[PDB]
């Protein structure tokens, strides 16, 4: 619930209401930023959290943070870009691109019909 304009690498406005320590707006699900000094999670006001290499805190420790299964956006401009619409499967994308450039299996865009 950060205030408008808050730096993307900054802290959230008021502290945790559980352990009275602050937290960054950015947080990972898992990954190496999970840091627990003792049995407590790390008071971040000490360390340089807008540093280049600062690792935001996560829920689960891992060598490496993981991917996510959510969906992703497709941004499209140019000829036939509107064929890229709605929720689709990922393999749909090059089929549009091929169709519109008149390459691949379907050369329908370059048919003499209209």
């Amino acid at each position: 619930y950060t205030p408008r304009g808050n730096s993307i690498f900054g802290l959230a406005p008021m502290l945790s209401d559980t352990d009275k320590k602050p937290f960054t707006a950015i947080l990972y699900g898992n990954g190496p930023g999970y840091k627990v000094v003792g049995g407590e999670r790390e008071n971040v006001s000490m360390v340089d959290y807008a540093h280049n290499n600062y690792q935001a805190q996560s829920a689960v420790p891992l060598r490496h943070e993981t991917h996510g299964g959510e969906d992703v956006a497709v941004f499209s401009k140019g000829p036939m870009a509107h064929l890229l619409h709605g929720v689709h499967e990922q393999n749909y994308v090059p089929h549009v691109m091929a169709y519109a450039a008149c390459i691949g299996a379907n050369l329908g865009h370059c048919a003499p019909a209209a």
Partner: protein, 130 residues
């Protein structure tokens, strides 16, 4: 299929289609007049099959459109067949027919901007004399 979006392609297969054509309306032409080699000029079906000269004319009539100019390859290829078979009268009639076609090419273009070149790939062991 590989032709640009708003262009006219035909495919013709007989002599009637070849002279029906309007060369102001055909961007891509494909014409395959026999299953294999075409008929010797002295054997040709006046009706279903065009002479070499007929094909050269509407070929130039199409290719004259492009304002950058054109390149055209013409092969009187059945002279080789005629000599290979030993049948001089066919081989010599094929050569005369390509000559006719060379005469046509001269009236449809001008020597000011067209370089044309007549040659042969090789010869035969054809002689004449006594």
């Amino acid at each position: 299929s590989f032709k640009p979006r708003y262009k006219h392609s035909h495919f013709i297969w007989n002599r009637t289609e070849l002279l029906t054509l309007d060369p102001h309306n055909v961007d891509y032409l494909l014409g395959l007049f026999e299953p294999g080699d075409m008929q010797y000029e002295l054997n040709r079906n006046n009706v279903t099959d065009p002479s070499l000269s007929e094909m050269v004319v509407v070929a130039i009539q199409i290719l004259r459109k492009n304002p950058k100019g054109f390149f055209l390859l013409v092969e009187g290829g059945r002279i080789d067949h005629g000599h290979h078979e030993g049948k001089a009268k066919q081989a010599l009639h094929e050569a005369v027919e390509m000559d006719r076609a060379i005469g046509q090419a001269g009236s449809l273009t001008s020597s000011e901007d067209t370089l044309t070149v007549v040659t042969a790939d090789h010869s035969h062991v054809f002689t004449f004399g006594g």
